[PDB]
Design a binder for this molecule. Structure first.
Ligand SMILES: [Mg+2]
Ligand SMILES: [Zn+2]
Length: 662
């Protein structure tokens, strides 16, 4: 048989990872698709009169095996893939796309859905009925037969291309890891980072050497400390050349097909299609907001560049930026990244920072379960309880980089909460922190600390879900809203009483001196020009790829012209991702949606102010935010939820102040 064929019997429905092997995936996908198709056919051909229960709720109940195999499989393909998994992914993804379309383009099924009245439905049920109609229409249910056939082909080709992009990027990223033969070339690097590079080299089959793998964004962390300028250049060139040339024609094809798809569905661009299901009201609203932010961000980056040139005494190349920014931080604030690292050890950050803040705010508690089996041996499983002692869900943390794990950081759910199924949330966080050798502490940069709080904010959004229908569970909200609960959770990484709790030396346990911790805080306002510009440049790049009139010929030429036209082609501030490694938009779901971060950040910064207005880190406030916003998933209109919580529509001034844009 097959461990996907029955519900998990483990706590919280944790999948039985000890019983699951690669050979189980294809038969479970095949059984799952066949059983869901049979379910949908029974609904569509039901001789009984259409009701919410026998149509919409019946669709929500369908696909139990398929949901179980997908949850594990897609978790593995992102976090701990292998050639067998990659081959399965190539085979199955097109079939899954064709499966989704066989349901959404089932004409009698859609006719049934359209016959359901909102009369006697409760609020979430009525909202779900509209959501179902919208999902079907956006998938092509109102197209004629010829256009549906072309749509099915476009979707399948898009799914295969995005898969190839992801696989290309992983292979090229891994192959572009920078090998250093002489430890002298690592001058400037903290001792702990040297040991991690030696450990990496050992793990990747090169004992005695040192390996510096690349992180997802353009900017590589080691450039802040490495004094060997030729090595800084070599790392930066390895970064910016990811996906060249193998992703260039591929992304051109993806963007071309997206445009053709969008027109087929009645939209002038892919961005117009995307924005139609975002909280942002129009494409013009997005471009108008970006147009206001870009000139002051660019002027800040120019001032910062002048300051870095004066510090260095000479002209800079892109691979010098971080290095001289660190010198300015040390001179201005007495903050040396090498001296800050010893205060931010993973276990302490996690327990006394991330968990601690959630306990103070929400009253929830955590029990580590080293006896429960995660999907990889380094996964930590935690049981999560409400303040009253009741069971809430499971949280899995997977903190370390490895060749099988894709770049960046993310949250995903193994089990979605719904009262329909009576399921409790099982959520996952993945980071890419460099793994130390045996015995050695995991000392984190503040960027990594922030990422931990960010991903945990998504975990809380999943954990706190109290919806009826799985369609609305947890993080199932528009992309330009989903980054609000994650970004707002980062507030607790810098809330001084929390930071003071976890910023303690890994050896002595001594707190950082109050006046130094003050300066570490001040020093994070530094470099907002670079940070904002690299972000805005990537946003406008995504936008250009998904609003073009005439299709691009050359990917690299297009990128250049896109950035130049948008006034963000700065030699010293490349976009946070270049086109050929922009995983957000080519393989994850942020196409014409990378603007989502800053759109959500409006809400985040305005919410920080709400906390200050209401007395700060108090249980009453956590209960309010949980009850009014985090527990709703997609089950209410998100901006309505926000307004009920905040007391009014959002204001942008708090974001503008934060990023130096006033
Ligand atoms: Mg002070
Ligand atoms: Zn996020």
């Amino acid at each position: 048989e097959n461990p996907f064929f029955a519900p998990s019997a483990l706590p919280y429905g944790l999948p039985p990872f000890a019983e699951i092997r690669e050979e189980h995936y294809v038969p479970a996908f095949e059984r799952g698709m066949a059983e869901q198709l049979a379910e949908v056919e029974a609904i569509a051909g039901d001789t009984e009169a259409p009701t919410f229960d026998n149509t919409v709720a019946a669709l929500e109940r369908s696909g139990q095996v398929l949901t179980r195999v997908s949850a594990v499989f897609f978790n593995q393909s992102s976090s701990d893939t292998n050639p067998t998994v990659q081959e399965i992914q190539k085979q199955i993804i097109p079939k899954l796309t064709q499966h989704g379309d066989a349901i959404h383009l089932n004409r009698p099924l859609f006719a049934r859905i359209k016959q359901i009245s909102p009369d006697g439905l409760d609020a979430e049920q009525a909202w779900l009925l509209e959501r179902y109609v919208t999902d079907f229409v956006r998938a092509g249910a109102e197209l004629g037969a010829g256009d549906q056939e072309r749509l099915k082909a476009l979707n399948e080709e898009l799914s295969t291309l995005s898969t190839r992009f992801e696989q290309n990027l992983l292979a090229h990223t891994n192959a572009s890891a920078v090998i250093v033969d002489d430890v002298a070339q690592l001058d400037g690097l903290s001792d702990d980072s040297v040991k991690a590079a030696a450990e990496t080299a050992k793990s990747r089959g090169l004992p005695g050497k040192y390996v510096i793998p690349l992180v997802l964004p353009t900017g590589q962390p080691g450039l802040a400390e490495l004094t060997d300028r030729a090595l800084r250049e070599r790392i930066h060139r390895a970064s910016i050349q990811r996906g060249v040339p193998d992703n260039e024609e591929l992304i051109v094809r993806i963007a071309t097909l997206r445009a053709e798809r969008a027109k087929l569905l009645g939209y002038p661009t892919h961005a117009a299609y995307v924005v139609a299901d975002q909280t942002a009201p129009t494409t013009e609203a997005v471009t108008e907001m970006l147009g206001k932010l870009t000139p002051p961000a660019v002027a800040n980056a120019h001032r910062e560049a002048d300051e870095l040139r004066e510090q260095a005494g000479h002209d800079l190349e892109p691979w010098d930026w971080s290095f001289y920014a660190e010198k300015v931080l040390k001179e201005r604030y007495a903050i040396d990244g090498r001296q800050m690292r010893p205060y931010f050890e993973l276990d302490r950050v996690l327990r006394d920072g991330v968990f601690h803040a959630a306990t103070l705010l929400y009253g929830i508690t955590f029990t580590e379960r080293p006896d429960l089996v995660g999907y990889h041996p380094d996964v930590r499983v935690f049981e999560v309880f409400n303040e009253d002692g009741s069971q809430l869900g499971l949280f899995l943390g997977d903190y370390y980089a490895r060749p099988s794990k894709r770049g960046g950081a993310w949250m995903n759910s193994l089990v979605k909460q719904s009262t329909l199924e009576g399921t409790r949330p099982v959520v996952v966080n993945n980071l890419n922190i460099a793994k130390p050798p045996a015995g050695e502490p995991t000392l984190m940069t503040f960027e990594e600390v922030n990422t931990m709080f960010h991903e945990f904010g998504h975990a809380l959004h999943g954990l706190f879900s109290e919806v009826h229908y799985p369609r609305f569970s947890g993080t199932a909200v528009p992309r330009d809203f989903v980054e609000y609960p994650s970004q707002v959770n980062e507030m607790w990484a810098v809330w001084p009483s929390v930071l003071a709790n976890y910023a303690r030396h890994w050896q002595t346990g001594d707190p950082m001196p109050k006046d130094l911790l003050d300066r570490m805080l001040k020093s994070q306002k530094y470099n907002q020009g670079y940070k904002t510009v690299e972000y805005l440049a990537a946003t406008l790049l995504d936008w250009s790829w998904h609003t073009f009139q005439t299709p691009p010929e050359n990917a690299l030429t297009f990128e250049h012209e896109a950035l130049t036209t948008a006034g963000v082609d700065l030699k010293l501030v490349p976009p946070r991702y270049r086109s050929t490694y922009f995983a957000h938009i080519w393989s994850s779901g942020y196409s014409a949606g990378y603007y989502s971060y800053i759109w959500s950040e409006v809400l985040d910064a305005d919410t920080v102010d709400w906390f200050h207005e209401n007395g700060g880190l108090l249980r009453e406030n956590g209960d309010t935010f949980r009850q009014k916003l985090l527990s709703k998933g997609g089950s209410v209109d998100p901006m309505t939820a926000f307004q009920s919580f905040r007391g009014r529509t959002p204001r942008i001034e708090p974001l503008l102040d934060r990023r130096g844009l006033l």
